Amino acid sequence: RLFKITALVPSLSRTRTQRELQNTYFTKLVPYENWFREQQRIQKAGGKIIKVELATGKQGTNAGL
Amino acid sequence: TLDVFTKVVSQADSRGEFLSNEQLDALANVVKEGNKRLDVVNRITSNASAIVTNAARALFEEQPQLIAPGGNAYTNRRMAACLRDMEIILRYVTYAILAGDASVLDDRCLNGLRETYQALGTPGSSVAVGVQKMKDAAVGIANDPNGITKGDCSQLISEVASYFDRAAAAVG
Amino acid sequence: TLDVFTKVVSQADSRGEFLSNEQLDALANVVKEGNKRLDVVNRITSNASAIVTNAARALFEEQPQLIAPGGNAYTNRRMAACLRDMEIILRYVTYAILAGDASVLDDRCLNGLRETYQALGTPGSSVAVGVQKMKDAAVGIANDPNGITKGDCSQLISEVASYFDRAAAAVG
Amino acid sequence: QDAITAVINSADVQGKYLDTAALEKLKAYFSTGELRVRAATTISANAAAIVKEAVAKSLLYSDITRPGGNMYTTRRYAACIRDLDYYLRYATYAMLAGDPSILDERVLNGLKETYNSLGVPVGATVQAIQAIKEVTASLVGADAGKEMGIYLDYISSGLS
Amino acid sequence: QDAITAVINSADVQGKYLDTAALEKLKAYFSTGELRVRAATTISANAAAIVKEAVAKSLLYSDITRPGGNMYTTRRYAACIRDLDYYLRYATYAMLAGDPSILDERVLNGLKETYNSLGVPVGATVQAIQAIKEVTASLVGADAGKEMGIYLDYISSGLS
Amino acid sequence: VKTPITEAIAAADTQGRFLGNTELQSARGRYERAAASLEAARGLTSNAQRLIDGATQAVYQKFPYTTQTPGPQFAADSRGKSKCARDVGHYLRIITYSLVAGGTGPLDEYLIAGLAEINSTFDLSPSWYVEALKHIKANHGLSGQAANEANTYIDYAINALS
Amino acid sequence: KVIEFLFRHLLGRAPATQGEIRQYNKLLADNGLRAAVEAIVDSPEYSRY
Amino acid sequence: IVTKSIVNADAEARYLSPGELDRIKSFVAGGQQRLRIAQALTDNRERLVKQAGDQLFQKRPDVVSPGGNAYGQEMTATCLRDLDYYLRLVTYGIVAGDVTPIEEIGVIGVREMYKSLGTPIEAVGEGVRALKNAASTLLSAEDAAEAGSYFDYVVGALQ
Amino acid sequence: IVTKSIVNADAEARYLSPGELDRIKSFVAGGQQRLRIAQALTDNRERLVKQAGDQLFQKRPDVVSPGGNAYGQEMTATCLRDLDYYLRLVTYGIVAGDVTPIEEIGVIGVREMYKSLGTPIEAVGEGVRALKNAASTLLSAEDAAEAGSYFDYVVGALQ
Amino acid sequence: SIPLLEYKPSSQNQRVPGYEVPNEDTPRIYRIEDAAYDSELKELIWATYRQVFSEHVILKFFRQGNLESQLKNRAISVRDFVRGLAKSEAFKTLVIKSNSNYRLVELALKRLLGRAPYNKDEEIAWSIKIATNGWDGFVDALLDSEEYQSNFGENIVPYQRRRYKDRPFNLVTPRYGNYWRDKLESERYIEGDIKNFLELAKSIEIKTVTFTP
Ligand SMILES: *[C@H](C)[C@H]1/C(=C/c2[nH]c(/C=C3N=C(/C=C4\NC(=O)C(CC)=C4C)C(C)=C\3CCC(=O)O)c(CCC(=O)O)c2C)NC(=O)[C@@H]1C
Ligand SMILES: CCC1=C(C)/C(=C/C2=NC(=C\c3[nH]c(/C=C4\NC(=O)[C@H](C)[C@H]4CC)c(C)c3CCC(=O)O)/C(CCC(=O)O)=C2C)NC1=O
Ligand SMILES: CCC1=C(C)/C(=C/C2=NC(=C\c3[nH]c(/C=C4\NC(=O)[C@H](C)[C@H]4CC)c(C)c3CCC(=O)O)/C(CCC(=O)O)=C2C)NC1=O
Ligand SMILES: CCC1=C(C)/C(=C/C2=NC(=C\c3[nH]c(/C=C4\NC(=O)[C@H](C)[C@H]4CC)c(C)c3CCC(=O)O)/C(CCC(=O)O)=C2C)NC1=O
Ligand SMILES: CCC1=C(C)/C(=C/C2=NC(=C\c3[nH]c(/C=C4\NC(=O)[C@H](C)[C@H]4CC)c(C)c3CCC(=O)O)/C(CCC(=O)O)=C2C)NC1=O
Ligand SMILES: CCC1=C(C)/C(=C/C2=NC(=C\c3[nH]c(/C=C4\NC(=O)[C@H](C)[C@H]4CC)c(C)c3CCC(=O)O)/C(CCC(=O)O)=C2C)NC1=O
Ligand SMILES: CCC1=C(C)/C(=C/C2=NC(=C\c3[nH]c(/C=C4\NC(=O)[C@H](C)[C@H]4CC)c(C)c3CCC(=O)O)/C(CCC(=O)O)=C2C)NC1=O
Ligand SMILES: CCC1=C(C)/C(=C/C2=NC(=C\c3[nH]c(/C=C4\NC(=O)[C@H](C)[C@H]4CC)c(C)c3CCC(=O)O)/C(CCC(=O)O)=C2C)NC1=O
Ligand SMILES: CCC1=C(C)/C(=C/C2=NC(=C\c3[nH]c(/C=C4\NC(=O)[C@H](C)[C@H]4CC)c(C)c3CCC(=O)O)/C(CCC(=O)O)=C2C)NC1=O
């Protein structure tokens, strides 16, 4: 139900003067429904995905998630 | 060793649900055709030894090289192996007719016959002819009405022709 | 059937020399830990039937399809196979703990278990899981001190956890 | 997940339908669900008094509420009240579901690492959860009290 | 990245310009790019029929599509269709680039951990990708079929 | 399995002889017995829900401690009572199996083989299912010759429990 | 108007052109407001702006 | 109805409402009748599925036409298995009181699935409507209103 | 191709690229041949539409079956009009070089439309494939590659 | 009647003398005439169950009350007692329904004679006798064989003769065969299949009309 993600996304636009440490490197909990498109956004931005982990869910659950 | 009844039982057993009414109705029909099943099984074992010798002569004419020297059924000892073992098809066929199922036929008389011949040198082709020469005479013995009441058993005699065809095609 | 002693004997027989001094120093340590070996083995057989039923319920919950119909352990005869049998792992494990060697465990309870299941249809993995549910309870039964003198046997209990892991990994 | 959805999921992994064993489990769940509803009302009555009595019995006048403790600061005390309150609310939810997996997936997912990283003591939380268990067992009743205590002890065992 | 940008990056790490060896690689890439365009059209024609024939050849009427399998549920079946549709689309992109690094960076970054965490079987996906490879090799042609199969086998080797 | 058709078959197999009139008369005896036994099975399959509800409640009122005593073996929790209707729901299948098969084959192969073997281990008292079957014996509601046919297999299971 | 409220609360800009209102009508109608909110936070303009 | 009430009170910060606790009490009170309806539908699995499928082929002969999807014994067996699956999900929804078991097992992604299978959606829907009519004829009257309204959810959600 | 290049350089902050200006120059250079292909397809409107529709009814007789949608003279006339519309959009896409005229006139919401009309999508797609085959036989060879690849976009986008 | 099929014997651990003087891992091969007690006969009656059935199928329901009583009385010789277990229809349903004829040779040699079969051609050799003589007649010819009566003798429980490094036979051979297992997978009752709906799909009548234009 909840994924534990950890990914880096570099800056391929112009360089930013704000620190932006979190954007470059983050670890966040994403729900299962949003995770496909949110991954696809990191897929688009050319960033590496380091660590994917199921936080809450169990594999192979047919009912009740 | 399975029946028509225990066929339905072991099929309903896996599901874990009690047998349906429709299935039961079908088994009530097997009770009604139960007396015709004893008509057909009693007619074969009465003509058992007469149909072994009669199918043997028609086999050993039409393949003369068997009792000719060098043949697989040449000497008097092997010849009795073949002649008397033609009962063992009929022993396990009339078991399956009275059972109404081909489970007893499969694990005794069918499970290793096509196995045992490569080590034995008995030709596979010869077996197909011999049992198939039993089938047209065993059906013809149970077909004709003489001193029995007339009925219809074409849906039941086709089971017997299926049993020999199961016994024939599993070897040759 | 080999010991820790006859392990050293048959190894020293192959080289054909006398028994060295440190081997007798090592076997003198087995004499000192000999009384700790007796207590652990004795404890298991006192809790033998209690750990068979307790590991069975934890197995048949977490794989419910076994005692469900169609499963390999569905019927009682089969079920009294998978349940009583679970003693036979423990029969040959506590032999090996009192022997101190895995030779008796190997040629009786390990030599054909991964063999016999392909012809049987029993699931090897499920059996392996069951033995791994024995191991964390058999170690936990011998671990706790209640009415015995306190000692240290972590170098000896690890032999027992190795024996179940030898019994588990040889099948699944 | 409920007890009903747990029964349905167990039968679905088997691939069969709901026959008499699962039906008897469902009848059992319905019979206890009546008193479960009554206990949910009587717990939602005075949840604040339950948390107040629990912290007054267990956490107050100790070293952790003194200067040099985890509950010294006013924001830390409010986080303790909220945390204690959450354990009561999710134990109520797990009581009404008849199933602790929703409770586990909700809080016991990450609360171990959170209390590890923040330096929150575990055993004081276990004592506070036990005090909640005693207060709710005294307030509600015997059998609904132990039904509440099963999931509260599940929380306390998951944190430990 | 392309084959062109790969050639440029290799020459840039060397620090030299594009002389005759790199130019001959570029002429080779142009000569195969014609049939690559024709194969992209004939793949984008009937991608749905390719995925349909692949799942009908490989995944249907098995234990995973039966109750008690990974593809039993309707949302799981739709996720399977969209994953095979992806593998075909990204193998088309990697065919037109002439370079598998964009394909690797796109999907093989995290699909291993995702199929690990969700419990998705790997070998059934490898069989499905092989069925896609056979269907596209029968549909497109010989040399463009094996050009497609190189990147499809790259996907199947990256998942394994 | 054991069936008086196959009882006639396996007896003629060991002697190595054909199906004479000795084995043949055992068949009809099974055949006309089914017509008083198949609607004896229809009386149980139609009343399936009634009896497993009736026998389970009859056990609790006979043994009132089995609902209160804490243990896995007992019916204190919900999963005990869920396993309660599974067990007596499993008994009524085999009785309908052994009525339809016409012999004690399915009672032998599926229920009573190792039945005294498991009850020593899981401390399930067999007198629990004795009172369970005796409620089914009195509440079946069957009448006539067919009823008598459904009455023996209930009593054949009771003597196997004891 | 819900769509302009969404673009204003999450971003502060609210509509740019009629066509994005068109493309958000379908996202509202298929599942509800939550799918359209997730489509707003999926959009690359949120990450740039 | 417990899961839906809990997640609805989860979206808010508050507990379960007295109204919702009345809903759970009424659901418990009607649960035994719902188990009786599930008992009848479990035991009538065969003939309900066959009558509904044959009513479908009476209404829609396009599927069993040789240009259609359900042409042949194996294809029509899978057709009847699909109707069996949907009747099983209807029994789950009658027992639970929610439609979340019906939804997340068989509704949520079925359009894209039957688009990729080549199967028409409307014939599935007409078959489930035939199941609704058959199970309405089998059961008691307002009990059939209860069963047919879950069937009605499945029919309206498939189209 | 000018609109797509302009909106693509609009998403960035920069002007049109030299690569994109080469694309526009090559599109201008091929534009006269594209007008010739549009001339041939305009003048072959009748027989192309009729041959493609009759090839469709040879392949798929379900639509003109009496259970099907295109049963009757008026329904089959609207079928041929739909094929006429799609051939017109294919000519627009051949002229423009983009597929944005094909898309925003006839692709973008066609699945929901033909779902609500009761019409199968795959038979539309098979008819446009028949149009592709017919217009491929009429034109010059690599000119037919050009026409059939826009037809290929329409076919793949309908399914 | 007819003499048996002539079979070549292979090299086997018991066929020859071996100079093991009593090794420990060798069985305790029991005798009836030692007993003189209540006590000894309960262990002896258990080891013959452990041989012929197997440990797993040694449950109380299968066991025969009449046979056990006879051994204590001593009316029947242990060699006459093993005939009870081999011709027991409680034994016969467990092994003859589930095993083919050639496996029935091998299982009887492996347990009763306590020896491995020599070759394949001798299970073929014993096979003809079983079909004609029945299961009881083949067992009767095995126990009255000269090989069985000389080596086990008259009152000694079956056991494996020589196993220097050889598998125990109970472990080595399953009660049932590899064939009968494949039937159990075939009648598993798969769930959610198209095959169980095939007999229902042919009963439904479907009429299709095609229009050509
Ligand atoms: C007959 C049409 C052909 C034929 C028969 C034949 N067979 C043998 C030898 C054997 N036959 C069997 C057959 C069975 N054994 C079984 O257990 C069963 C099922 C119950 C069957 C059908 C076996 C095992 C043998 C091996 C020896 C034996 O009798 O025990 C012979 C004798 C051959 C010989 O002695 O070398 C013969 C003549 N052979 C033919 O020529 C016919 C074509
Ligand atoms: C405000 C606190 C803070 C810091 C310091 C910070 C650093 C930071 N440096 C980065 C990259 C980088 N950092 C460097 C730095 C160097 N290269 C060298 O050879 C030198 C050793 C060193 C320069 C002195 C380079 C070259 C990159 C880009 C590498 C790439 O192309 O991916 C990135 C990745 C995204 C990016 O900016 O491109 C972050 C987040 N972020 C923060 O929030
Ligand atoms: C076990 C001892 C036993 C036997 C043998 C037996 C046979 C038997 N066969 C019968 C009928 C019959 N049997 C047959 C059989 C056939 N007619 C044909 O033309 C076919 C070729 C053939 C089947 C292949 C028929 C047609 C009837 C008519 C009556 C009926 O349906 O039973 C009946 C009805 C009652 C009667 O005849 O008095 C009896 C008794 N009943 C017994 O108790
Ligand atoms: C001394 C070493 C030794 C072992 C361990 C051994 C096992 C063994 N277990 C067997 C059967 C069996 N084994 C099991 C056990 C299981 N099946 C299940 O469903 C469970 C998953 C699992 C237990 C956890 C069962 C139930 C049977 C009976 C199966 C049958 O009769 O077809 C059989 C074949 C029949 C038999 O004689 O009982 C052997 C040979 N034999 C040996 O000589
Ligand atoms: C064959 C029958 C038999 C048994 C069972 C037996 C056990 C046994 N264990 C003993 C001691 C002992 N046994 C243990 C065992 C342990 N303590 C721990 O804390 C560990 C967890 C565990 C080992 C894993 C210890 C620590 C002692 C102390 C005395 C000694 O060293 O023997 C002794 C010393 C004498 C006595 O206790 O009266 C006996 C008798 N003796 C026998 O004749
Ligand atoms: C574009 C590059 C890319 C890919 C490929 C991708 C895959 C991907 N597949 C997923 C799930 C899934 N993937 C499968 C796949 C399969 N099941 C099987 O048995 C087969 C072996 C295999 C189908 C051929 C299934 C069944 C799920 C859903 C499992 C669940 O219910 O949680 C998920 C989790 C969210 C979801 O879609 O439901 C992602 C992110 N994401 C991406 O960004
Ligand atoms: C197919 C034929 C068949 C039947 C019927 C069968 C019953 C059976 N019931 C068991 C346990 C049980 N049986 C019951 C049933 C009851 N206990 C009670 O308190 C009630 C009085 C009663 C129900 C009315 C319960 C609650 C358990 C679990 C007990 C435990 O885990 O210790 C067990 C041992 C553990 C198991 O696998 O679940 C078996 C083998 N097994 C079979 O193979
Ligand atoms: C529990 C939720 C669930 C559903 C609904 C489901 C459907 C389902 N239908 C299938 C095939 C099929 N489904 C149909 C269906 C139909 N024939 C028609 O024309 C009618 C409109 C419709 C009958 C309702 C046909 C004809 C096939 C065979 C198509 C093929 O084999 O390509 C298949 C692939 C083969 C299989 O695994 O059985 C699945 C998975 N699976 C599920 O797990
Ligand atoms: C330019 C983009 C565009 C398209 C595509 C379009 C289609 C379109 N098709 C229609 C009907 C129809 N369309 C078909 C189509 C077909 N018969 C089949 O089976 C085949 C799969 C398919 C032929 C390709 C049929 C049979 C009808 C009549 C349905 C009715 O009258 O209800 C209608 C309603 C009546 C009308 O206004 O003509 C529209 C608007 N309109 C548009 O503006």
Swiss-Prot record, chain A:
Any GO CC annotation of this UniProt entry: phycobilisome
Gene3D superfamilies from the UniProt entry: Allophycocyanin linker chain (domain) (3.30.1490.170)
Keywords: Antenna complex, Membrane, Photosynthesis, Phycobilisome, Thylakoid
SMART domains: CpcD (SM01094)
BP GO terms, sorted: photosynthesis
A Pfam family that the UniProt record links to this protein: CpcD
Protein name per the record: Phycobilisome 7.8 kDa linker polypeptide, allophycocyanin-associated, core
UniProt source species: Nostoc sp. (strain PCC 7120 / SAG 25.82 / UTEX 2576)
The organism's taxonomic lineage, starting at the top: Bacteria, Bacillati, Cyanobacteriota, Cyanophyceae, Nostocales
Protein's gene: apcC
Curated annotation (Swiss-Prot), chains D, E:
Main location (coarse class): membrane
Membrane topology: Peripheral membrane protein
PTM sites of type N4-methylasparagine: 70
GO terms for biological process, alphabetical: photosynthesis
Subcellular location: Cellular thylakoid membrane
One cellular component term from this protein's GO annotations in UniProt: plasma membrane-derived thylakoid membrane
Residues given in the record as (2R,3E)-phycocyanobilin binding sites: 80
Key words, A-Z: Antenna complex, Bile pigment, Chromophore, Electron transport, Membrane, Methylation, Photosynthesis, Phycobilisome, Thylakoid, Transport
Leader sequence segment: none
Family indicated by similarity: Belongs to the phycobiliprotein family.
Assembly behavior: Heterohexamer of two alpha chains, one alpha-B chain and three beta chains.
Functional description taken from the UniProt entry: Light-harvesting photosynthetic bile pigment-protein from the phycobiliprotein complex. Allophycocyanin has a maximum absorption at approximately 650 to 653 nanometers.
Protein name as annotated: Allophycocyanin subunit beta
Name of the gene: apcB
Swiss-Prot record, chain F:
Family matches, as CDD domains: PC-PEC_alpha
Domain of life according to the entry: Bacteria
Subcellular location as annotated: Cellular thylakoid membrane
InterPro entries in UniProt: Globin-like_sf (IPR009050), Phycobilisome_asu/bsu (IPR012128), Phycobilisome_asu/bsu_sf (IPR038719), Phycocyanin_a (IPR006246)
Keyword vocabulary terms for this entry: Antenna complex, Bile pigment, Chromophore, Electron transport, Membrane, Photosynthesis, Phycobilisome, Thylakoid, Transport
Cysteines paired by S-S bonds: none
Membrane-traversing stretches: none
Chief location bin: membrane
A biological process from GO: photosynthesis
Modification comment: Contains one covalently linked phycocyanobilin chromophore.
Gene Ontology CC terms, in alphabetical order: phycobilisome; plasma membrane-derived thylakoid membrane
Membrane protein topology class: Peripheral membrane protein
Residues that hold (2R,3E)-phycocyanobilin according to the record: 84
Family of the protein in this entry: Belongs to the phycobiliprotein family.
The protein's role, per its UniProt record: Light-harvesting photosynthetic bile pigment-protein from the phycobiliprotein complex (phycobilisome, PBS). Phycocyanin is the major phycobiliprotein in the PBS rod.
Subunit structure: Heterodimer of an alpha and a beta chain, which further assembles into trimers and the trimers into hexamers. Part of 2 PBS rod complexes, the conventional PBS rod and a photosystem I-specific CpcL-PBS rod.
PANTHER family (alphabetical): C-PHYCOCYANIN ALPHA SUBUNIT, PHYCOBILISOME 32.1 KDA LINKER POLYPEPTIDE, PHYCOCYANIN-ASSOCIATED, ROD 2-RELATED
NCBIfam families assigned to the protein according to its UniProt record, in alphabetical order: phycocy_alpha (TIGR01338)
Protein name per the record: C-phycocyanin alpha subunit
From Swiss-Prot, chain G:
Domain of life: Bacteria
Record PTM text: Contains one covalently linked bilin chromophore. This protein autochromophorylates.
Compartments in which it is found: Cellular thylakoid membrane
Quaternary structure and partners: Heterodimer of ApcF (a variant beta-allophycocyanin). Phycobilisomes of this organism are composed of a two cylinder core, from which six rods radiate. The core is mainly composed of allophycocyanin alpha and beta chains and of minor components.
Purpose of the protein: This protein is postulated to act both as terminal energy acceptor (by its phycobilin-like domains) and as a linker polypeptide (by its repeats and arms) that stabilizes the phycobilisome core architecture. Has intrinsic bilin lyase activity.
Protein family membership: Belongs to the phycobilisome linker protein family.
Protein name: Phycobiliprotein ApcE
Name of the gene encoding the protein in the UniProt record: apcE
